Scaffold this motif. Structure first.
Motif, PDB file in Angstrom:
ATOM      1  N   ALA A 112       0.715  11.713   0.543  1.00  0.00           N
ATOM      2  CA  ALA A 112      -0.376  12.318   1.464  1.00  0.00           C
ATOM      3  C   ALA A 112      -1.047  13.349   0.722  1.00  0.00           C
ATOM      4  O   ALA A 112      -0.608  14.278   0.688  1.00  0.00           O
ATOM      5  CB  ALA A 112       0.042  12.177   2.839  1.00  0.00           C
ATOM      6  N   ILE A 113      -2.381  13.086   0.734  1.00  0.00           N
ATOM      7  CA  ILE A 113      -3.322  14.429  -0.121  1.00  0.00           C
ATOM      8  C   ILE A 113      -4.433  14.524   1.016  1.00  0.00           C
ATOM      9  O   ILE A 113      -5.102  13.547   1.284  1.00  0.00           O
ATOM     10  CB  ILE A 113      -3.582  14.197  -1.225  1.00  0.00           C
ATOM     11  CG1 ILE A 113      -4.344  12.715  -1.463  1.00  0.00           C
ATOM     12  CG2 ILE A 113      -2.645  14.244  -2.252  1.00  0.00           C
ATOM     13  CD1 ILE A 113      -4.618  12.315  -2.933  1.00  0.00           C
ATOM     14  N   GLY A 137      -8.164  16.683  -7.915  1.00  0.00           N
ATOM     15  CA  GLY A 137      -7.105  17.049  -9.031  1.00  0.00           C
ATOM     16  C   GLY A 137      -5.824  16.313  -8.387  1.00  0.00           C
ATOM     17  O   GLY A 137      -4.906  15.857  -9.338  1.00  0.00           O
ATOM     18  N   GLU A 138      -5.534  16.629  -7.027  1.00  0.00           N
ATOM     19  CA  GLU A 138      -4.296  15.954  -6.555  1.00  0.00           C
ATOM     20  C   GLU A 138      -4.200  14.540  -6.750  1.00  0.00           C
ATOM     21  O   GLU A 138      -3.333  13.712  -7.085  1.00  0.00           O
ATOM     22  CB  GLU A 138      -4.020  16.522  -5.197  1.00  0.00           C
ATOM     23  CG  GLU A 138      -3.863  17.970  -5.072  1.00  0.00           C
ATOM     24  CD  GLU A 138      -3.625  18.489  -3.358  1.00  0.00           C
ATOM     25  OE1 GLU A 138      -2.544  17.782  -3.014  1.00  0.00           O
ATOM     26  OE2 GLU A 138      -4.443  19.319  -2.993  1.00  0.00           O
ATOM     27  N   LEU A 139      -5.189  13.939  -6.255  1.00  0.00           N
ATOM     28  CA  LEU A 139      -5.505  12.405  -6.483  1.00  0.00           C
ATOM     29  C   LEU A 139      -5.410  12.120  -8.130  1.00  0.00           C
ATOM     30  O   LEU A 139      -4.572  10.943  -8.172  1.00  0.00           O
ATOM     31  CB  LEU A 139      -6.853  11.963  -5.902  1.00  0.00           C
ATOM     32  CG  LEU A 139      -7.246  10.283  -5.883  1.00  0.00           C
ATOM     33  CD1 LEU A 139      -5.752   9.784  -5.468  1.00  0.00           C
ATOM     34  CD2 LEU A 139      -8.260   9.913  -4.994  1.00  0.00           C
ATOM     35  N   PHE A 140      -5.837  12.676  -8.864  1.00  0.00           N
ATOM     36  CA  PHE A 140      -5.971  12.238 -10.164  1.00  0.00           C
ATOM     37  C   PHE A 140      -4.501  12.375 -10.906  1.00  0.00           C
ATOM     38  O   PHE A 140      -3.856  11.690 -11.571  1.00  0.00           O
ATOM     39  CB  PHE A 140      -6.709  13.260 -10.975  1.00  0.00           C
ATOM     40  CG  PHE A 140      -6.598  13.210 -12.560  1.00  0.00           C
ATOM     41  CD1 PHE A 140      -7.095  11.825 -13.361  1.00  0.00           C
ATOM     42  CD2 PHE A 140      -6.082  14.111 -13.351  1.00  0.00           C
ATOM     43  CE1 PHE A 140      -6.964  11.999 -14.702  1.00  0.00           C
ATOM     44  CE2 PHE A 140      -5.889  13.996 -14.671  1.00  0.00           C
ATOM     45  CZ  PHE A 140      -6.219  12.997 -15.380  1.00  0.00           C
ATOM     46  N   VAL A 141      -3.693  13.494 -10.509  1.00  0.00           N
ATOM     47  CA  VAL A 141      -2.478  13.780 -10.935  1.00  0.00           C
ATOM     48  C   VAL A 141      -1.315  12.605 -10.230  1.00  0.00           C
ATOM     49  O   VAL A 141      -0.168  12.371 -10.781  1.00  0.00           O
ATOM     50  CB  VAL A 141      -1.806  15.146 -10.772  1.00  0.00           C
ATOM     51  CG1 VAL A 141      -1.633  15.389  -9.266  1.00  0.00           C
ATOM     52  CG2 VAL A 141      -0.683  15.626 -11.809  1.00  0.00           C
ATOM     53  N   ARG A 142      -1.992  12.161  -9.140  1.00  0.00           N
ATOM     54  CA  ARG A 142      -1.127  11.063  -8.310  1.00  0.00           C
ATOM     55  C   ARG A 142      -0.815   9.787  -9.259  1.00  0.00           C
ATOM     56  O   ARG A 142       0.245   9.161  -9.094  1.00  0.00           O
ATOM     57  CB  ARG A 142      -1.436  10.854  -7.031  1.00  0.00           C
ATOM     58  CG  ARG A 142      -0.540  10.219  -6.164  1.00  0.00           C
ATOM     59  CD  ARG A 142       0.705  11.083  -5.980  1.00  0.00           C
ATOM     60  NE  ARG A 142       0.343  12.237  -5.734  1.00  0.00           N
ATOM     61  CZ  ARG A 142       0.083  12.908  -4.563  1.00  0.00           C
ATOM     62  NH1 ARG A 142       0.185  12.322  -3.620  1.00  0.00           N
ATOM     63  NH2 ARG A 142      -0.127  14.023  -4.759  1.00  0.00           N
ATOM     64  N   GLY A 143      -1.826   9.597 -10.075  1.00  0.00           N
ATOM     65  CA  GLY A 143      -1.869   8.555 -10.870  1.00  0.00           C
ATOM     66  C   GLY A 143      -3.141   7.682 -10.995  1.00  0.00           C
ATOM     67  O   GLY A 143      -3.355   7.199 -12.020  1.00  0.00           O
ATOM     68  N   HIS A 157       0.812  -1.145   0.068  1.00  0.00           N
ATOM     69  CA  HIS A 157       0.125  -0.061   0.019  1.00  0.00           C
ATOM     70  C   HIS A 157       0.948   1.309   0.024  1.00  0.00           C
ATOM     71  O   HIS A 157       1.752   1.460   0.760  1.00  0.00           O
ATOM     72  CB  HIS A 157      -0.974   0.041   1.074  1.00  0.00           C
ATOM     73  CG  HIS A 157      -1.736  -1.227   1.527  1.00  0.00           C
ATOM     74  ND1 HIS A 157      -1.228  -2.522   1.736  1.00  0.00           N
ATOM     75  CD2 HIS A 157      -3.159  -1.476   1.160  1.00  0.00           C
ATOM     76  CE1 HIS A 157      -2.420  -3.536   1.768  1.00  0.00           C
ATOM     77  NE2 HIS A 157      -3.221  -2.967   1.499  1.00  0.00           N
ATOM     78  N   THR A 158       0.357   2.098  -0.973  1.00  0.00           N
ATOM     79  CA  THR A 158       1.444   3.434  -1.034  1.00  0.00           C
ATOM     80  C   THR A 158       0.679   4.554  -0.975  1.00  0.00           C
ATOM     81  O   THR A 158       0.854   5.701  -0.358  1.00  0.00           O
ATOM     82  CB  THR A 158       2.122   3.271  -2.324  1.00  0.00           C
ATOM     83  OG1 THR A 158       1.207   3.101  -3.222  1.00  0.00           O
ATOM     84  CG2 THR A 158       3.224   2.207  -2.122  1.00  0.00           C
ATOM     85  N   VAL A 159      -0.692   4.704  -1.535  1.00  0.00           N
ATOM     86  CA  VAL A 159      -1.638   5.861  -1.532  1.00  0.00           C
ATOM     87  C   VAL A 159      -2.208   6.050  -0.129  1.00  0.00           C
ATOM     88  O   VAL A 159      -3.097   5.063   0.186  1.00  0.00           O
ATOM     89  CB  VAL A 159      -2.487   5.931  -2.673  1.00  0.00           C
ATOM     90  CG1 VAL A 159      -3.568   6.576  -2.539  1.00  0.00           C
ATOM     91  CG2 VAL A 159      -1.624   6.160  -4.115  1.00  0.00           C
ATOM     92  N   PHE A 160      -2.252   7.104   0.483  1.00  0.00           N
ATOM     93  CA  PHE A 160      -2.906   7.405   1.642  1.00  0.00           C
ATOM     94  C   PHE A 160      -3.960   8.596   1.320  1.00  0.00           C
ATOM     95  O   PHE A 160      -3.071   9.886   1.290  1.00  0.00           O
ATOM     96  CB  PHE A 160      -1.854   7.654   2.913  1.00  0.00           C
ATOM     97  CG  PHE A 160      -1.378   6.148   3.369  1.00  0.00           C
ATOM     98  CD1 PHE A 160      -2.422   5.502   4.336  1.00  0.00           C
ATOM     99  CD2 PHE A 160      -0.259   5.639   3.344  1.00  0.00           C
ATOM    100  CE1 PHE A 160      -1.969   4.368   4.655  1.00  0.00           C
ATOM    101  CE2 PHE A 160      -0.070   4.295   3.900  1.00  0.00           C
ATOM    102  CZ  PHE A 160      -0.916   3.458   4.621  1.00  0.00           C
ATOM    103  N   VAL A 161      -5.162   8.411   1.445  1.00  0.00           N
ATOM    104  CA  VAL A 161      -5.705   9.549   0.846  1.00  0.00           C
ATOM    105  C   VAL A 161      -6.328  10.234   2.192  1.00  0.00           C
ATOM    106  O   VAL A 161      -7.422   9.559   2.823  1.00  0.00           O
ATOM    107  CB  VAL A 161      -6.833   9.287  -0.132  1.00  0.00           C
ATOM    108  CG1 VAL A 161      -8.111  10.022  -0.115  1.00  0.00           C
ATOM    109  CG2 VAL A 161      -6.231   9.471  -1.657  1.00  0.00           C
ATOM    110  N   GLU A 162      -6.034  11.192   2.796  1.00  0.00           N
ATOM    111  CA  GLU A 162      -6.516  11.630   4.065  1.00  0.00           C
ATOM    112  C   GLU A 162      -7.818  12.428   3.851  1.00  0.00           C
ATOM    113  O   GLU A 162      -7.604  13.649   2.824  1.00  0.00           O
ATOM    114  CB  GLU A 162      -5.402  12.522   4.803  1.00  0.00           C
ATOM    115  CG  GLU A 162      -4.224  11.696   5.169  1.00  0.00           C
ATOM    116  CD  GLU A 162      -3.245  11.512   4.028  1.00  0.00           C
ATOM    117  OE1 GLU A 162      -3.391  12.321   3.032  1.00  0.00           O
ATOM    118  OE2 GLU A 162      -2.486  10.546   3.766  1.00  0.00           O
TER     119      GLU A 162
END
Length: 240
Positions: A200-201, A219-225, A177-182
């Protein structure tokens, strides 16, 4: 792929993760918040000591226990207000950056050992179904894959026993697990997570709880990948 939280942050972390129905999750949170308001208030507070578990526990005075293991370098303490004042004075004498937080109710300490039966009565048989999205538990530090087990007992235990956030985060990092969406009205878990993984976003912030911040976080989540379905926000129109 998973939903993580801390204490109360674990309420809807169990709701939309397929581990709680909406009505009974609402029942659980209403009872929890009312119990916190009725009894826990005026019996302690949280003070953030900007050190790890070892450093703070080397200086821990009687009556105050580590609130949780938030990281090898950031551990908050909770206990009786007088011991908090003494420890804070000692820490300021040492010059270590320490910050109180204006909490009138002492959370996840010995004070929880008094109204356990109230939570047992109020949270008996809540529809906490088997998680379609398995949330690696923090009370026992292992994935739970059963239906109806997660009753109010473990909810109280999370409210009482210390949360091993650092260990859970380390295990999740080691398991891919790498993506942590706060997601909250203002970041609280970003700093520790970011110092551990650098990704972390946060969703909302103070004074900026409008649509613009929501689109910024998306947009931050989308640009993360990760891929997002933007077509819901914007409808169709003429040719340009």
């Amino acid at each position: 792929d998973a939903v993580v939280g801390h204490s109360q942050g674990e309420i809807a972390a169990a709701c939309v993760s397929g581990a709680l129905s909406l009505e009974d999750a609402a029942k659980v949170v209403a009872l929890r918040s009312q119990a916190i308001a009725a009894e826990l208030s005026g019996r302690g507070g949280m003070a953030s000591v900007a050190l790890g578990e070892d450093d703070v526990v080397s200086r821990l005075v009687d009556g105050v226990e580590v609130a949780a293991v938030n990281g090898p370098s950031s551990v908050v303490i909770a206990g009786d207000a007088h011991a908090l004042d003494a420890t804070l004075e000692i820490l300021s004498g040492e010059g270590i950056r320490v910050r109180r937080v204006a909490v009138d109710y002492a959370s996840h300490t010995r004070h929880v050992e008094d109204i356990r039966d109230t939570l047992a009565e109020t949270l008996a048989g809540i529809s906490a179904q088997a998680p379609a999205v398995p949330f690696y538990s923090t009370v026992t530090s292992e994935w739970v894959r059963d239906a109806g087990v997660l009753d109010g007992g473990y909810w109280y235990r999370n409210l009482r026993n210390q949360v091993r956030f650092g260990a859970a985060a380390t295990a999740l990092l080691e398991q891919g697990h790498t993506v942590f969406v706060e997601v909250s009205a203002h970041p609280v878990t970003v700093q520790p997570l970011s110092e551990l993984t650098g990704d972390a976003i946060g969703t909302l912030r103070r004074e900026d709880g409008g649509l613009r911040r929501l689109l910024a976080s998306m947009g931050e989540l989308f640009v993360r990948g990760i891929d997002v379905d933007w077509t819901a926000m914007v409808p169709a129109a003429g040719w340009v």
